Structure formats: structure tokens, C-alpha cells
């Protein structure tokens, strides 16, 4: 559909769609300045996503957005890198879940 967010390598294996984009704010209380991490702004955020195999375990490692896990996730079809599971540390943050995928690596 035109809504739909596939894999750029294997075209036919939707990730995520449209519909399931928001905006993460990135700042914490009072919208402080933050010293940039990783690289968001190639960065995609979804609240759902599918066709996307998990990798490991959750890690807190060098995390691109503070207060989130990471988790590797790739494609199910071709296994290609399309981002991460982000899963929250404290039980009072919203959403719980989220995706970061990577822009370059989805058609559109
Ligand atoms: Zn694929």
C-alpha cells in the first residue's frame, strides 16, 4: 500500500507503515540542551513494526536515546539491518517500546 515501509533489499517485506511514525522528543524536563549521541536524524521512529527478526538481548550500551534499550533488528526475509528495538528502563516512561530504523535502509 502507499502507507507501507518495506526493506530495501528484498522490496516485498513491509517493516513499518506510515501510520505508525511519531516524534520521540529527545530532550529531558524543561527541554534542556542534549549533547548529541548517535545519529537520529537517519533515524526513523515507529511505535510498531513487523517482519523483523530480534537479536540478542536488550543492552543500555552507548544508547541512542537515554532511558532506552537497544536491541539489533534485521530483516526476517534477507537479514539485513534495518534498526533497533527500543525497550524503556523505568516502567514510567512512554511508549514503553518503540523502533528506531534506519531511513536509507527502507523504500520509500
Ligand atoms: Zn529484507
Given at each position: 500500500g502507499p502507507t507501507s515501509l518495506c526493506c530495501?533489499?528484498?522490496?516485498?517485506?513491509?517493516?513499518?507503515?506510515?501510520?505508525?511514525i511519531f516524534s520521540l522528543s529527545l530532550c529531558g524536563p524543561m527541554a534542556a540542551y542534549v549533547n548529541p549521541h548517535g545519529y537520529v536524524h537517519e533515524t526513523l521512529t515507529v511505535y510498531k513494526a513487523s517482519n523483523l527478526n530480534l537479536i540478542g538481548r536488550p543492552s543500555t550500551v552507548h544508547s541512542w536515546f537515554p532511558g532506552y534499550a537497544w536491541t539489533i533488528a534485521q530483516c526476517?526475509?534477507?537479514?539485513?539491518?534495518?534498526g533497533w528495538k527500543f525497550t524503556a528502563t523505568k516502567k514510567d516512561m512512554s511508549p514503553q517500546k518503540f523502533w528506531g530504523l534506519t531511513r536509507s535502509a527502507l523504500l520509500p
Open positions: 530495501k533489499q528484498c522490496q516485498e517485506t513491509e517493516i513499518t507503515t506510515k501510520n505508525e526476517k526475509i534477507c537479514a539485513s539491518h534495518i
